[PDB]
């Protein structure tokens, strides 16, 4: 088990962690993490980006009182730290089945809006517009729902099982990916409000799916114990299927810098949650990390670096390319 390259202390348990995938106009990479009753927004700078930094410079920028356990965080594309018009916008899902949109100027103006209408737990959410006006959410009510920033439901797709992950297509307009617990991944067009296509996993339950940003034909997921890769439009069947974890895989995320590298996490388990970093050319994980109990997995935008939340700590692994 590799030790984490960097470790940052947190006030409480980290339930979710997400790097800002967008350019905020700052030299540092923005990071959001959700606790039991709060969301923290921080800036991270690494020695690999700036030779004036020894290891990791971690600065808390803002803390938002949430009052509920945060389960998912989505960054808005409008998020900017530019000194002329700073705007922080992100969405959260929590155990109360509500979405909260937070807006801040990083000064005194801190607003949040509550969106209601899911009848079950929300499992995942994303901003599903380049303009950052629309939010997609999925949950245990067997719905995928589309919301404006006004909290009005624009659209609703009835699922055949609980929606487990949702992702916007990185290049193609109007394409939403929805991963269902029974192994089906569906693609929806938000203009026509129609399902375009599905993929099926060989294993169940399907727990997380992500798009490869560097190769928009590739989808990766975790189902049962295994990680699964599809290459579109070649087949509805997996191209690759290999073991990820000895007992239940939970999260899958593609590296933002390398189309052959991805991370998986094991389920919040008695054997301390393993992070496994995989490279498609290798039959085994290139790195196996241990986090004592960790939830959330996110990749840095530029560096070959991933973060996992744990017990009062963030753990960072740099992958040698």
């Amino acid at each position: 088990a590799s030790n984490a390259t960097y470790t940052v202390d947190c006030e409480d348990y980290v339930h979710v962690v997400e790097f800002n995938p967008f350019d905020s106009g700052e030299a540092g990479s923005l990071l959001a993490y959700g606790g039991i009753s709060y969301v923290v927004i921080a800036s991270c700078r690494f020695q690999e980006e700036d030779s004036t930094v020894e290891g990791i410079e971690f600065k808390t920028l803002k803390t938002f009182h949430h009052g509920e356990r945060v389960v998912a965080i989505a960054w808005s594309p409008e998020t900017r730290c530019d000194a002329l018009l700073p705007l922080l916008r992100f969405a959260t899902a929590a155990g109360d089945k509500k979405i909260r949109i937070f807006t801040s100027d990083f000064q005194d103006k801190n607003e949040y809006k509550v969106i209601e209408g899911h009848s079950g737990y929300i499992n995942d959410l994303v901003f599903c517009s380049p303009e950052g006006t629309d939010i997609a959410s999925v949950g245990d009510d067997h719905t995928c729902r589309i919301w404006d920033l006004d909290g009005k439901q624009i659209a609703m797709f009835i699922l055949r099982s609980p929606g487990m992950s949702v992702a916007w297509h990185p290049e193609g307009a109007f394409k939403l990916m929805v991963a269902e617990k029974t192994g089906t991944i569906r693609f929806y067009d938000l203009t026509t409000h129609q399902a375009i296509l599905s993929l099926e996993s060989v294993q169940v339950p399907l727990m997380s799916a992500d798009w490869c940003v560097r190769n928009t034909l590739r989808i990766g997921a975790v189902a049962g114990n295994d990680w699964i890769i599809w290459e579109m439009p070649r087949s509805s069947y997996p191209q690759d299927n290999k073991p990820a974890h000895a007992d239940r895989a939970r999260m899958f995320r593609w590296s933002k810098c390398n189309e052959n590298v991805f991370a998986t996490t094991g389920y919040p388990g008695k054997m301390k949650s393993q992070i496994a970093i995989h490279h498609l050319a290798h039959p085994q994980p290139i790195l196996i990390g241990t986090a004592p109990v960790g939830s959330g997995l996110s990749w840095h935008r530029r560096l070959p670096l991933c973060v996992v939340g744990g017990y009062r700590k963030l753990f960072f692994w740099l992958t040698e390319m």
């Binding site: 919040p268 388990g269 008695k270 054997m271 301390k272 109990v293």
Partner: peptide, 8 residues
């Protein structure tokens, strides 16, 4: 305890 969730 058997699932290994000591905080809960």
């Amino acid at each position: 305890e058997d699932v290994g969730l000591p905080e809960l």
